[PDB]
């Protein structure tokens, strides 16, 4: 019902380095075209958290807007990576990949984007952990997002933040204490500036609406950059008009209007409650990982 889900905040770049052969429709994602790195995020029933905050950035978008850094190394060569630590981290994370993908990406324990990739003519197995060659396969040109998450820019320092969960020995690759039930649990997490992955007992989010540029979707459908729209008390490259939210902060002309700007439902600054403090995270998401808990 939202016709502007493909009108992305920031640059809207949904490609991964090395796989640039879908740039026509992924750089940027926009109204027209299909993008194998992005479209799966809008399949109803899948990625519910992102679909509730769909006007925030995807992981690839955050990376290309310099909000999230790339892991070092940026990828794990699954064909020959057995025994390496990047395969170790990926293996504790229960994931499902659809067929025909040669890459999948995720936010790792250091709060950086990592990926697993397969050599030419190979695709990821269903668990996203290995590679196989299917003789009848039309391979995608993008990377599959492994986690249900969303991102935003933030300067809020999270250096003193760390994972704290009641009676948990280990969560994913994080050993919280010395120690036991063991199970695959869907754990929420957040990443903050200068922090690592912070797993959470509970996901407590609140959204503060605002009139920042990323809270608006503009069109001429064809996307339009709001930076050309003059603020109230300013001038710009073009002339614009919008809804009540837009006109409260921008100069609405309503005559010779080059673009129309609406307020994006599901934008604004998200804040998360971590150990009784509200903080502004860089990314927030869910992932299915091994959790070991104390019976005692």
């Amino acid at each position, epitope marked *: 019902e939202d016709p502007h889900l493909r009108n992305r905040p920031g640059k809207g770049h949904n490609y991964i380095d090395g796989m640039t052969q879908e740039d026509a429709t992924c750089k940027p994602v926009t109204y027209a075209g299909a993008c194998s790195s992005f479209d799966v995020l809008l399949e109803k029933g899948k990625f519910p958290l992102f679909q509730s905050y769909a006007h925030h950035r995807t992981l690839l978008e955050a990376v290309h807007d310099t909000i999230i850094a790339k892991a*070092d190394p940026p990828s794990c060569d699954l064909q020959s990576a057995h025994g390496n630590p990047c395969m170790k981290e990926k293996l504790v994370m229960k994931t499902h990949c659809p067929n025909d993908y040669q890459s999948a990406h995720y936010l790792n324990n250091d709060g950086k984007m990592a990926s697993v990739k397969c050599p*030419p003519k190979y695709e990821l197995t269903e668990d996203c952990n290995f590679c196989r060659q299917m003789t009848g396969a039309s391979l995608k040109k993008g990377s599959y997002p492994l986690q249900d998450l969303f991102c935003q820019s933030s300067e809020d320092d999270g250096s003193k933040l760390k994972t704290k969960m009641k009676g948990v020995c280990e969560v994913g690759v994080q050993a919280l204490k010395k120690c036991l039930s063991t199970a695959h649990e869907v754990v929420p997490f957040a990443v903050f500036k200068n922090s690592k992955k912070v797993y959470l007992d509970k996901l407590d989010l609140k959204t503060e609406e605002n009139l920042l540029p990323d809270s608006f979707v503009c069109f001429e459908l064809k996307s339009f950059d709001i930076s050309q729209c003059p603020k109230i008390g300013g001038h710009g490259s073009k002339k614009c008009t919008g809804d009540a939210a837009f006109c409260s902060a921008y100069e609405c002309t309503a005559q010779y209007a080059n673009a129309y700007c609406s307020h994006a439902n599901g934008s604004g600054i998200v804040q998360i409650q971590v150990s009784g403090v509200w903080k502004k995270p860089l990314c927030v998401g869910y992932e299915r990982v091994v959790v070991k808990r104390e019976l005692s």
Partner: antibody, heavy 119, light 109 residues
Framework: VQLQESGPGLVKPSQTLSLTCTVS??????????WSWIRRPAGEGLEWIGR???????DYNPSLRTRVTISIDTSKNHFFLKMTSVTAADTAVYYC????????????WGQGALVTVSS | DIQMTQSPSSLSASIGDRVTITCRAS??????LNWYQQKPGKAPKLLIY???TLQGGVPSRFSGRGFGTDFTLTINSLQPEDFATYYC??????????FGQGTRLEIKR
């Protein structure tokens, strides 16, 4: 699939270098490939000029983005390079190529067209 | 730009020898590194793509390896027709695609 460059071998300084690449075999229309131009300047290595998608989207080398226009006519299996305000530094062998499906490697290549910039 | 540096810039080797060509990227490019061979009077031709996958029809004496910043093209049993200039090329970024400066292979006889 086979590629072939064609065009004038002599361009005067400050004028416009134009080249055409002809693709043989099946039609590029409907396909999803990128198509690149590469050159080997006189006494130098290889330099990527830019690329155009089957649908018309383009990407250019940043050091050449102001002088280069690459376009495609999929109904005739052609794509085109235009470079304005050429100087002797643009004397080179120019190659067209089809890009890889999953990453921007180059296969196959054209035969190469020598273009000399001179009065 | 991602700078691609090849080593050696030139070398002379005898028929039957092993020739080793190294390519260094100025940053991590995973396996997105491709190798081309250009014989005299001919256009470059793809030899190896994504670091180690051989182009169809290329003989088994050509092989490639590498991941990250250090890549290696190996020609076992050098043959007289292998006289050429060899180039590496990163396909990690298109702004711009960059090539190595080339390695010229001479036949010693």
């Amino acid at each position: 699939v086979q590629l072939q460059e064609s065009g004038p071998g002599l361009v005067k300084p400050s004028q416009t270098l134009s080249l055409t690449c002809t693709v043989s075999g099946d039609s590029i229309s409907g396909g999803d490939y990128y198509w690149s131009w590469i050159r080997r300047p006189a006494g130098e290595g290889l330099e990527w000029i830019g690329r155009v998608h089957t649908t018309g989207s383009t990407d250019y080398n940043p050091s050449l983005r102001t002088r280069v226009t690459i376009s495609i006519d999929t109904s005739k299996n052609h794509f085109f390079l235009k470079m304005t305000s050429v100087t002797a530094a643009d004397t080179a062998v120019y190659y067209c190529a089809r890009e890889g499906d999953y990453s921007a490697w180059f296969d196959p290549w054209g035969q190469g067209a020598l273009v000399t910039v001179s009065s | 730009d991602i700078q691609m540096t090849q080593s050696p810039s030139s070398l002379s080797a005898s028929i039957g020898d092993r020739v080793t060509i190294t390519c260094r990227a100025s940053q991590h490019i995973e396996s997105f590194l491709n190798w081309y061979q250009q014989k005299p009077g001919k256009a470059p031709k793809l030899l190896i793509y994504i670091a180690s996958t051989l182009q169809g029809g290329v003989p088994s004496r050509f092989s490639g390896r590498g991941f990250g910043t250090d890549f290696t093209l190996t020609i076992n049993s050098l043959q007289p027709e292998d006289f050429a200039t060899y180039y590496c090329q990163q396909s990690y970024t298109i702004s711009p695609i960059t090539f190595g400066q080339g390695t010229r292979l001479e036949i010693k006889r």
